[PDB]
């Protein structure tokens, strides 16, 4: 049972904690926590490639894409590894994240420890938008809060 954690901070007021857990190797990952300070609605949720926050959330680079694929919702098969789709913030701007994904891992070639979790401005269109940008970033808009994923 490997655990991991991330603390999301930004320039704006957005901030939260997201925990990872992976019972079995190369198994599935439980991802859970709470982001507060969001605009009510949907927000793109991504693991970007680098754990670099020197120029803030910009340094995180692109979505984690070790297999060199196009963008997609987490349920699709054409997807980046760090493409986790969208989180929902309520009338109080709090998103209670509760995901379970089976592509990202805490170990091996798909390991995200040392990479950056990022909550985005708008909503990820899951690649179904119909312009070149939707197949890369998914038009999730700019980056609101980020953090390096560390070990627990």
């Amino acid at each position: 049972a490997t655990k991991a954690v991330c603390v999301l901070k930004g320039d704006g007021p957005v901030q939260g904690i997201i925990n990872f857990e992976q019972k079995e190797s190369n198994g599935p990952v439980k991802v859970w926590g709470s982001i507060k300070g969001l605009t009510e609605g949907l927000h793109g949720f991504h693991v970007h490639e680098f754990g670099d926050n020197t120029a803030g959330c910009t340094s995180a680079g692109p979505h984690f894409n070790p297999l060199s694929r196009k963008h997609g919702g987490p349920k699709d098969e054409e997807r980046h590894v760090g493409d986790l789709g969208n989180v929902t913030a309520d009338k109080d701007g709090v998103a209670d994240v509760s995901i379970e994904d089976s592509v990202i891992s805490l170990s091996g070639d798909h390991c995200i420890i040392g990479r950056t979790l990022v909550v985005h401005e708008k909503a990820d269109d899951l690649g179904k938008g119909g312009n070149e940008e939707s197949t890369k970033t998914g038009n999730a808009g700019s980056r609101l809060a980020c953090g390096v994923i560390g070990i627990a």
Partner: nanobody
Amino acid sequence: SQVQLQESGGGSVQAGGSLRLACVASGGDTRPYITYWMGWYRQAPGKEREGVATIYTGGSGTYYSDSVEGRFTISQDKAQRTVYLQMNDLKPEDTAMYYCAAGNGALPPGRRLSPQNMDTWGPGTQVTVSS
């Protein structure tokens, strides 16, 4: 550069009357994803600031204090950068100075209507209810 709040609309009114306070925000970071917990606070002479209602700038969540629950209603025009307070069925006990204040959008439950966790304040407007 800094956010600044200005109240308006207090005055004198008869027990049972209505008032609609409004606070308009000026300057500061105008970008939509900068959420605050805009709130109305109430200080009577010789007592402590109370805080009667708050609203999320990011969404629509509203929380009221138990002493004004049925009577006060806090609304907002995010595009006009305004937050309103319809106080009706006014008691004599509601006489006080009414301040509008802003605070971090990420404040957790329990710290959203506390004036200590509040960042910038408006100067105040006086509301007096006669009986």
